[PDB]
């Protein structure tokens, strides 16, 4: 009865545990080519990818 | 101080940090392959038959 629910891991894979913070990694992006929210890209939207940092929306990058 | 309305822009630059090269290199570095089993040197009949 537990077959397939009970699974069990690999050796090499791990969860990870670990918090950081994630306060200089939307600045990065920006100065990336990630135009955010509230500016407009310099191609149309649909030519142009959401990017979605741990929950928080963030920008719009170019195709 | 009246600060009056202006034309349309042209065009807008987009000023960016430039892409990270020489990060990679031309060849590929792979983990090497494993060796196959060897047969052991100094291997000889232990065993010799009784009587």
């Given at each position: 009865?537990?077959?397939?629910?009970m699974?069990?891991?690999?050796?090499?894979?791990?969860?990870?545990?670990?918090?950081?913070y994630?306060?200089?990694?939307?600045?990065?992006l920006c100065?990336?080519?990630?135009?955010?929210?509230d500016?407009?890209?310099?191609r149309?939207?649909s030519e142009?990818?959401?990017?979605?940092?741990?929950?928080?929306?963030?920008?719009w990058?170019?195709? | 101080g009246?600060?009056?309305?202006?034309?349309a822009?042209?065009?807008?630059?987009?000023?960016?940090e430039?892409?990270?090269?020489?990060l990679?290199?031309?060849?590929?570095?792979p983990?090497p392959?494993?060796?196959?089993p060897?047969?052991?040197p100094?291997?000889?009949?232990?065993f010799?038959?009784?009587?």
């Amino acid at each position: 009865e537990p077959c397939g629910l009970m699974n069990h891991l690999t050796a090499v894979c791990e969860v990870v545990t670990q918090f950081v913070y994630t306060a200089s990694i939307p600045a990065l992006l920006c100065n990336l080519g990630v135009t955010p929210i509230d500016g407009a890209p310099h191609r149309s939207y649909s030519e142009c990818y959401p990017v979605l940092l741990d929950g928080v929306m963030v920008g719009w990058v170019d195709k | 101080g009246g600060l009056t309305c202006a034309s349309a822009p042209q065009g807008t630059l987009r000023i960016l940090e430039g892409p990270q090269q020489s990060l990679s290199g031309s060849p590929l570095q792979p983990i090497p392959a494993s060796p196959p089993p060897q047969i052991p040197p100094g291997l000889r009949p232990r065993f010799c038959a009784f009587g």
